[PDB]
């Protein structure tokens, strides 16, 4: 659950986020929308397709 046999954490792993916490809360309330609406769009049917095709066209050369 914690890679690296030397994790100090506590006031050291988040001490860096405490600075972004003030930003994320701002750029993390209206930015996730587009991201998703854009992710589940070009990252839902695109990967599957390009993936499926790469197995139908790659299995040979091009449109058999």
From Swiss-Prot:
Glycosylation sites noted in the Swiss-Prot or TrEMBL record: 15
Question: Where does it reside?
Answer: Cell membrane
User: Any stretches that span the bilayer, and where are they?
Assistant: 31-54
Similarity comment: Belongs to the G-protein coupled receptor 1 family.
Name assigned to this protein: Apelin receptor
Record annotation: effect of changing residue 19 to A: Decreased APLN/apelin-13 potency
Gene that specifies this protein:
APLNR
User: Could you list which ranges are Extracellular topological domains?
Assistant: 1-30
Role this protein plays? G protein-coupled receptor for peptide hormones apelin (APLN) and apelin receptor early endogenous ligand (APELA/ELA), that plays a role in the regulation of normal cardiovascular function and fluid homeostasis. When acting as apelin receptor, activates both G(i) protein pathway that inhibits adenylate cyclase activity, and the beta-arrestin pathway that promotes internalization of the receptor. APLNR/APJ also functions as mechanoreceptor that is activated by pathological stimuli in a G-protein-independent fashion to induce beta-arrestin signaling, hence eliciting cardiac hypertrophy. (Microbial infection) Alternative coreceptor with CD4 for HIV-1 infection; may be involved in the development of AIDS dementia.
Source organism per UniProt: Homo sapiens (Human)
Q: How does it assemble?
A: Homodimer; dimerization inhibits APLNR-mediated G protein and beta-arrestin signaling pathways compared to monomeric APLNR.
Per the record, the domain of life is Eukaryota
Task: Provide the free-text tissue specificity comment from this protein's UniProt record.
Answer: Expressed in heart, brain, kidney, stomach, spleen, thymus, lung, ovary, small intestine and colon, adipose tissues and pancreas. Expressed in glial cells, astrocytes and neuronal subpopulations. Expressed in embryonic (ESCs) and induced (iPSCs) pluripotent stem cells.
